[PDB]
Amino acid sequence: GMSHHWGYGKHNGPEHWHKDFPIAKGERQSPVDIDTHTAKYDPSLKPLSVSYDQATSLRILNNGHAFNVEFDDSQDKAVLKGGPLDGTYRLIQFHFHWGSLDGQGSEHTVDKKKYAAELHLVHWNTKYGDFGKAVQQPDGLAVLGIFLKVGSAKPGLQKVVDVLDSIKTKGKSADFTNFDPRGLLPESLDYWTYPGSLTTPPLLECVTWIVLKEPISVSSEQVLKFRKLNFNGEGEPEELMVDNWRPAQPLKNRQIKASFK
Ligand SMILES: Cc1cc(=O)oc2cc(CS(N)(=O)=O)ccc12
Ligand SMILES: [Zn+2]
């Protein structure tokens, strides 16, 4: 990726990605709009199992696109299973996509509604040994998506908000141990699920998407901090890190299933 130049600006944004990553116009791209009236309840979907009690966060990184909270996935600690998944998926990192204003920022939409932001907890299928091998498989990753709306503060998110000052620019990282991701979950685990892809290049079609129906609420102050981050590196002209979301892509030959009636 040392020669990647994609981003979210007018000249290298989502509409340009297909040039270096043809799969951008593929058959199972993400995100997508979730038409609530067309999604069908699937009584055969197992309950979702989110086991994060043993999760071990290690570091937070500004990668020039978003910020990644990374976990130690060298062992089966934090795992996602059940739901539409077969097997065990290990949590490797989480990040967000957000907007310049509260009216936009999420990648998936619900009946065309855009949320202020969207949290993605990324997990890889342990049957493939490592993340690199997993992304080359149609069932290699499981990403849990959670919508954020602006209202009351999310206590569990403040530790993340407070460390952002230390990783303002691209390439900066900071120790970030003992962060509990259970603090970012809504009360209900009802979800929609469909086969899709990574939403940033390489846009690989290796993801089983699980998007929770219940959004979490974060405060204006919390999201304002996200918007103070920079896409640029230290010493460069400031480009605020905002609107780092890819818009909804064609659903094509796919069905979105609901875990609830
Ligand atoms: C670890 C990793 C490798 C890769 O090639 O692409 C990624 C894309 C995302 C963004 S998202 N929105 O698709 O989760 C997150 C993590 C990765
Ligand atoms: Zn993402």
- Quote helix, strand, coil % in the chain, to nearest 5: 15, 30, 55
Spatial contact of 181 and 77, defined as CB atoms under 8 Å apart: no
Please report whether residue 9 resides in a domain: no
Assess if residue 5 is contained within a domain.
Answer: no
- Largest separation between any pair of C-alpha atoms in the chain: 54
Helix residue ranges per DSSP H, the chain: 131-134, 158-163, 220-226
Q: Which amino acid appears at position 26 of this protein? A: G
Question: To the nearest 10°, the Cα dihedral for 188, 192, 196, 201?
Answer: -40
Domain presence at residue 28: yes
- Residue 252 within any structural domain of the chain: yes
Residue 95 assigned ligand-binding role: yes
Residues 240, 226, 203, 41, Cα dihedral to 10°: -140
Number of domains in the chain: 1
Experimental method reported for this structure = X-ray
Judge whether 7 lies within some domain: no
Measured between alpha carbons, how far is 42 from 24 in angstroms, rounded to an integer? Answer: 29
Tell me the C-alpha distance between 94 and 121, whole Å.
4
Does some domain include residue 74?
Answer: yes
Closest CA to 77 of 57, 62, 63: 57
Residue among 197, 196, 200 nearest 245 (CA): 200
Q: Is 141 in the pocket of ligand 1 (CB under 6 A)?
A: no
Residue whose entry in the numeric block shows the structure tokens 């129906």? 213
Q: Say how far apart CA 81 and CA 89 lie, in whole Å.
A: 6
At 63, the amino acid letter reads N
Nearest C-alpha to atom 7 of ligand 1 is from which residue?
Answer: 198
In a domain, 2, yes or no: no
Are 128 and 73 in contact, with CB atoms under 8 Å apart? no
Residue 109, marked binder: no
- Our answer on whether the CB atom of 246 is closer than 6 Å to any ligand 1 atom is no
What Å distances lie between residue 116 and 46, 63, 77, 132, CA to CA? Answer: 29, 21, 30, 31
* Residues labelled as active-site residues: 65
* Ligand 2 centroid, distance to 120 Cα (angstroms): 5
Nearest to 230 by CA among 172, 169, 174, 173: 169
Q: Using a 6 Å cutoff on CB, does residue 143 contact ligand 1?
A: yes
Is 123 labelled as part of a ligand binding site? no
Number of the ligand 1 atom closest to the C-alpha atom of 30: 13
Q: Which residue has 């795992």 as its token pair?
A: 79
198 C-beta closer than 6 A to ligand 1: yes
Q: How many helices (H) and strands (E) does the chain have?
A: 3, 15
Residue at 40 is within a domain: yes
Residue 28: give its domain's CATH number: 3.10.200.10
Cα→Cα distances 5→66, 202, 253, Å: 15, 12, 31
Residue among 200, 205, 209, 249 whose CB has most ligand 1 atoms within 8 A, to mutate: 200
Domain that holds residue 64: 14-258
**Other C-beta atoms within 10 Å of 177: how many?**
10
Task: Tally Cβ neighbours within 10 Å of residue 47.
Answer: 8
